[PDB]
Structure formats: structure tokens, C-alpha cells
Coordinates of C-alpha atoms in Angstrom, one line a residue:
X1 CA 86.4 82.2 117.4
X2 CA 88.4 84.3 115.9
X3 CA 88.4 88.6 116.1
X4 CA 88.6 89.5 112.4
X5 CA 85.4 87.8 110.9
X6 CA 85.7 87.4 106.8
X7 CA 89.1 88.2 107.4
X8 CA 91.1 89.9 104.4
X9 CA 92.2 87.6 101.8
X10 CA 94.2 83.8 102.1
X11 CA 94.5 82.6 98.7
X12 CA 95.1 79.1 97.3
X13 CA 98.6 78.9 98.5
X14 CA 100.8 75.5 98.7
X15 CA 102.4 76.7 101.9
X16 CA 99.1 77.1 103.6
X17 CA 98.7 79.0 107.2
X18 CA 99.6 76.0 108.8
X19 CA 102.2 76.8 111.5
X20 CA 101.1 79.5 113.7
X21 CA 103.3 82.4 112.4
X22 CA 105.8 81.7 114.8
X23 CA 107.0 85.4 114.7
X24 CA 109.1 86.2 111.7
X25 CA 109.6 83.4 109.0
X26 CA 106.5 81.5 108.9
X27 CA 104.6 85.0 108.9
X28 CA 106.0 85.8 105.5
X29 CA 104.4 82.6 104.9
X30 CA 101.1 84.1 106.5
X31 CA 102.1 87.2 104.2
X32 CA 102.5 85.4 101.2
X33 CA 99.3 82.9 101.8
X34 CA 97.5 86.4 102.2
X35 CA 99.2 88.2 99.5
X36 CA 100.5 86.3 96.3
X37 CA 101.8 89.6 94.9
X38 CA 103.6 91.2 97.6
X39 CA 105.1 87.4 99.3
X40 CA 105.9 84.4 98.3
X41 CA 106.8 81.8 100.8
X42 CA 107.6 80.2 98.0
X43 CA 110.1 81.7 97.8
X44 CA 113.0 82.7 99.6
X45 CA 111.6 86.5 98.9
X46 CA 111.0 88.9 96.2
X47 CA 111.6 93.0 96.2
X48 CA 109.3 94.1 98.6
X49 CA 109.2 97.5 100.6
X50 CA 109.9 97.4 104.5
X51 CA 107.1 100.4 105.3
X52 CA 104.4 98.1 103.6
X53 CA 104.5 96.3 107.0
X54 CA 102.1 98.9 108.2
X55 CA 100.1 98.0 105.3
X56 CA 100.2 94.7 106.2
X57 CA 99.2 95.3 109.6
X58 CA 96.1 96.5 108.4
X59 CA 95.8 93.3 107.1
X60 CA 97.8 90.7 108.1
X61 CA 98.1 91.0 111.7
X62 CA 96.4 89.6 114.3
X63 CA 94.0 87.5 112.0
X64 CA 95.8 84.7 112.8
X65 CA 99.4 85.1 114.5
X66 CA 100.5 88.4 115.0
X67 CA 101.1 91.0 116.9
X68 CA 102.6 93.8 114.4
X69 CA 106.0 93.1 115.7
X70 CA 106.2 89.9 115.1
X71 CA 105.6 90.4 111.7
X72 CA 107.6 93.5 111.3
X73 CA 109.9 91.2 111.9
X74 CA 109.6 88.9 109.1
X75 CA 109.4 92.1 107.2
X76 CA 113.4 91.7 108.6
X77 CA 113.9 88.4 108.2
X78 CA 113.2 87.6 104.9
X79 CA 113.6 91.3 103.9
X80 CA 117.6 90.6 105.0
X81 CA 117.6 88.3 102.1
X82 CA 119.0 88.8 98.7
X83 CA 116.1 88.1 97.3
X84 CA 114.4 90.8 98.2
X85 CA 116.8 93.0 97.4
X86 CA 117.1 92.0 94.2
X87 CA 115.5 95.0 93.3
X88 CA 113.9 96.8 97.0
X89 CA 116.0 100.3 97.4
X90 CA 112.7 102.2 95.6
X91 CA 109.3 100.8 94.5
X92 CA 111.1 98.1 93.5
X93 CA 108.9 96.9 96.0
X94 CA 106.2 97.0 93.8
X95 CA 104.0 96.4 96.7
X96 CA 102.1 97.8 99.3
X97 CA 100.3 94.8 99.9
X98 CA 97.7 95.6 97.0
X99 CA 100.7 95.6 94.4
X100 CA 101.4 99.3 94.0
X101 CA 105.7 100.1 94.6
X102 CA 104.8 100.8 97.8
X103 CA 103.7 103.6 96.0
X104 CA 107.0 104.9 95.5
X105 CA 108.0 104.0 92.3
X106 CA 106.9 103.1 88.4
X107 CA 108.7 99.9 87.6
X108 CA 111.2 102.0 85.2
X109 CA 113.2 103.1 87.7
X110 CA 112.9 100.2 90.1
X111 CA 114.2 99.0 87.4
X112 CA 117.6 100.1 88.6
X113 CA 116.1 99.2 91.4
X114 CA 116.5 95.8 89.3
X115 CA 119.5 96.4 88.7
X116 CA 121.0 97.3 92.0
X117 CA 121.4 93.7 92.8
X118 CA 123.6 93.7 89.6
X119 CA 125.4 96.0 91.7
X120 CA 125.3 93.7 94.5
X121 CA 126.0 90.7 92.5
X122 CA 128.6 92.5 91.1
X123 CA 130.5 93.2 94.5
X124 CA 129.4 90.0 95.2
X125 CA 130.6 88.2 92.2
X126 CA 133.9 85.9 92.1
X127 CA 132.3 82.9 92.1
X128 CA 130.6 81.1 89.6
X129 CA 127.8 81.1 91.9
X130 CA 125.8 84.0 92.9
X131 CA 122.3 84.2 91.1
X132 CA 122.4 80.6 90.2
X133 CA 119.0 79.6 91.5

């Protein structure tokens, strides 16, 4: 079974491709299971790009549980988290899939890119809490 044969890359992730994708969140998980530079799954998110989804969809897609969109997606869902954007306005990314700022940026000015969540946490602020965990 199975179109892709010797399909891409899963690595030795803790998450593991065990849910069927389910169309957004666990797909980050597929993302992440598949590529342990760009996704986590781990974790909530990191900076990644949003035009790397194509990049993924070389990849990622249909190897398991998705069809593009549905993964596009995820590359919303998680990609509306902080997390992310704790650096992702440039190649803050620092991924298309392989690990290249979606090929955008060096790191040195992603590195604002790094620091444009200091401008978020900064609006954000108030609280004690913000980036607290």
C-alpha cells in the first residue's frame, strides 16, 4: 500500500505519525516527524516560513494524510501561534524544509526577525507572563 514508496524522511520522533494528520494540527506533527529542523510537534512551534508549505508538499503531502490543503493549513494553524513568530517575518524561518531561511534570509537579520517578537512581547507585555515557558 501506500503511493510514495521509500517515502522522504520520518525520523525518530516521540510524537510519531500516529493519528492520521487529521488536517491541520496533527500534520505539523506529520511535518515535524518528517522534518526535525523545520517542525517540532514538540513543540507548540518554532519560526518557520508559510511559502515552505509548497516545499513541504513536495514532501510531506500525501505520503500519509494529506492533500496540500490540509496541510497548508497547519502551516495556519500552528503558524498563528507565537511561537512561530517568535522570529518568522524574514528567513527567520530558517527553513524550507531542508533548513535553508526559506531561503530568504542569513540568520543576522532574522535576527530581528528574533527580535520582532521582542516587539510583539513588547506590545504584548504587562504581565509578568509572556515568554515564560
Amino acid at each position: 500500500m501506500g503511493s510514495s514508496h521509500h517515502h522522504h524522511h520520518h525520523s525518530q520522533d516521540p510524537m510519531e505519525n500516529q493519528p492520521k494528520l487529521n488536517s491541520s494540527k496533527e500534520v505539523i506533527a506529520f511535518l515535524a516527524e518528517r522534518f526535525p529542523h523545520c517542525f517540532s510537534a514538540e513543540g507548540e512551534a518554532r519560526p518557520l516560513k508559510i511559502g515552505i508549505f509548497q516545499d513541504l508538499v513536495d514532501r510531506v503531502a500525501g505520503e500519509m494524510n494529506l492533500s496540500k490543503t490540509q496541510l497548508r493549513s497547519a502551516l495556519r494553524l500552528y503558524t498563528s501561534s507565537w511561537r512561530y513568530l517568535y522570529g518568522v517575518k524574514p528567513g527567520a524561518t530558517r527553513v524550507d524544509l531542508d533548513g535553508n531561511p526559506c531561503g530568504e534570509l542569513d540568520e543576522q537579520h532574522v535576527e530581528h526577525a528574533r527580535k520582532q517578537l521582542e516587539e510583539a512581547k513588547a506590545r504584548v507585555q504587562a504581565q509578568r507572563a509572556e515568554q515564560q515557558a
